[model samples]
Target: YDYLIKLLALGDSGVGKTTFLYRYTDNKFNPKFITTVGIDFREKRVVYDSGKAFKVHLQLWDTAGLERFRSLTTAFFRDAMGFLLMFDLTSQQSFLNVRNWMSQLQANAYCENPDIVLIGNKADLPDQREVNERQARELAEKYGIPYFETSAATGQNVEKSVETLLDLIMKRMEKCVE
Candidate 1:
């Protein structure tokens, strides 16, 4: 069996990386939070209109967003074809940490430039939102990636998040393959 794409969920600790994965993969959201000790993964087959409707196998890499677990996570980045750089919209600190994750991703990835999308998660809490869309969008612009505001809890933009990234990646892949 071959993978059509390999994607990763990356962010800071307590920022709901696991929740996002569960919400995206299982469509189940647990209010409880558990720290991913090292790393975990899930697989989902999605049929999208990249060109025509076809089943695309995505190996979703759920990474531990902790300083200690970074070493383990970095090892896995090299093989990933795309990335979901997530952060808690309510926590400015988590949003700031996205840069560090990007650095780690670039350092370890097989290519110097990897396909990445910036995701501001926990968008359900509008009042508590600390990271504004404009700020994130500017940063994404600086990094030359797309930015998406999502809520894993409400499943808002969760599917579209990955689909958009995959679409961008497929364009590059198709170019490279030919």
Candidate 2:
């Protein structure tokens, strides 16, 4: 039987979570992307370097940043094998609220050691910089997670981020099997 990996894409609304999945799975970029209403799921096959195949079930949960979604968001975080925590680099408020999202993960996720990759989205918006790379790196270090500065619009580091997360998952799986 093949392993199945469930990944959750979580962050504030309008942080390009859907667009990042579109870019990674479909390899197509949408310039004028719209916000996901509630949740979206995409499935793909991942083949490790050793030729082991696994099914990747990516759940892109686009919860409203407002208080309305707070009570319901925790349910989706449970049992996630990996998490892509996205933040908008052009919005300081979105970057600042990362801790809230991390808190949600901690409160609900069944596995505390799930692979988490912090993504700073909209990296192409240089003029409207809100979160610097150094700050994002520092936060990732503090949380002990990998970090990537990605622009889904330009497809920069989109695949790389997903690939890194997959690598992390594979390593975890190996450790478990051993």
Candidate 3:
């Protein structure tokens, strides 16, 4: 039997959460934009370096950027093994609001020590960037989580982020196995 890891993708609406999911799962990008109403789900199978097959169940909770979905989204946070806190690097507002996302995760997720990764999306728009790598890294370090800069548009670091998070989860699982 294969192990399953539940990961939550939490971010502001239109921060490229759905686009990232499309890029990783289908390996395709859509130029058109659509807002995620409440939540979306996707899954991918990953083969780890240790030869263990694991299924990553990604719960892409594309909560409304507004406050309406706040309580509703909190209910799904339980039993989450990992979190992908995404932000649009080109948008200063999105980057600054990452703390709110983190707070929601902490309040709702069951795991006190859940693994969280800071995803800086839209890295392809280098010229329009409002958040630099250093700022992102500092935030990750402060929160004691991993950080990644990705661009679903150009497929840059998209797969790597998913794989890296899976690896981390698997390693933790192995330790528990031992």
At residue 172, give the lDDT of candidate 3.
68
The candidate with the higher lDDT, 2 or 3, is: 2
Candidate 2's C-alpha runs over 4 A off are 27-75, 103-112
Ten residues in a row with the worst lDDT in model 2? 30-39
The lDDT values for all models are 0.77, 0.77, 0.75
Q: Which residue pairs show collisions in model 2?
A: none
TM-score for all predictions?
A: 0.67, 0.67, 0.66
What tens digits encode model 3's per-residue C-alpha lDDT throughout 1-178? 6776788787899999888897578745445433345545566555444376666654444544455455446656666677788989889788778866555654543334667788899887789988878877877887777888888899988888988888877776666773
Please give the RMSD of candidate 1 to the true structure: 20.4
TM-score for candidate 2, please give it.
0.67
Model 3 segments more than 4 A misplaced: 27-75, 103-112
Model 1 C-alpha lDDT versus the unseen true structure: 0.77
Q: Which digits, one per residue and each the tens of the lDDT, describe model 1 over residues 90-111?
A: 9998977776655665354334
Counting clashing residue pairs in each candidate, in order, gives 0, 0, 0
lDDT of 2 by residue, 1-178 (tens): 6777778887899999988887578655535423334544555555444476666655454444355354346656566778898989999888789966665654433234778889889988889997778877877887789888899999999888888988988887777763
